């Protein structure tokens, strides 16, 4: 599968999975396991939202093409064959970014990397629903991270200090 292999335009109704798909593309070489589950979350969320409008069914079909392609590429990778190994992989990576961004936050260092790490950590917790229900701790870290990210971002956007 090509780097940045294009899907058809994203249906307006799937606007809520836009950033999960972007995260997938950004990890397509760095970490195909993350890229795979990010797409899986987007597929599975898309189906629940609208799987009968034609545009959406087209989009979903193309997305499954990339999933199937990537499952092929990954083969006997344990993070794919064993869900819980995939879950631990994503969870450890989400926590890594969260602890990174949190450390920056506590030091008063506010910048694009710490903002993106907060928001990606929350996107990864979304993705972790494909392994089962979120824990109370997942839910709190997700909310916390989304808040810091959009808040710090909007401050800096408007020349204010958070």
């Amino acid at each position: 599968m090509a780097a940045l292999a294009p899907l058809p335009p994203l249906p307006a109704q799937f606007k809520s999975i836009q950033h999960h798909l972007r995260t997938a593309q950004e990890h397509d070489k760095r970490d195909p396991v993350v890229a795979y589950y990010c797409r899986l979350y987007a597929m599975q969320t898309g189906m629940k939202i609208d799987s009968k409008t034609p545009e959406c069914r087209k989009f979903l079909s193309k997305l499954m093409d990339q999933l199937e392609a990537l499952k092929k590429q990954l083969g006997d990778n344990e993070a794919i064959t064993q869900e819980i190994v995939g879950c631990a992989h994503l969870e450890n990576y989400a926590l890594k970014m969260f602890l990174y961004a949190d450390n920056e936050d506590r030091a008063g260092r506010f910048h694009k990397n710490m903002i993106k790490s907060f928001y990606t950590a929350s996107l990864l917790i979304d993705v972790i629903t494909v392994f089962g229900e979120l824990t109370d701790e997942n839910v709190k870290h997700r909310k916390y991270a989304r808040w810091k990210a959009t808040y710090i971002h909007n401050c800096l956007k408007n020349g204010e200090t958070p």
């Binding site: 899986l40 597929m43 599975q44 189906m47 799987s51 069914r57 979903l60 079909s61 499954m64 999933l67 199937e68 499952k71 064959t81």
Partner: peptide
């Protein structure tokens, strides 16, 4: 539903 089955096959079940 063609989709639903590809998903089930994707997730090895």
């Amino acid at each position: 539903d063609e989709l639903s089955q590809r998903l089930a096959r994707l997730r090895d079940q």
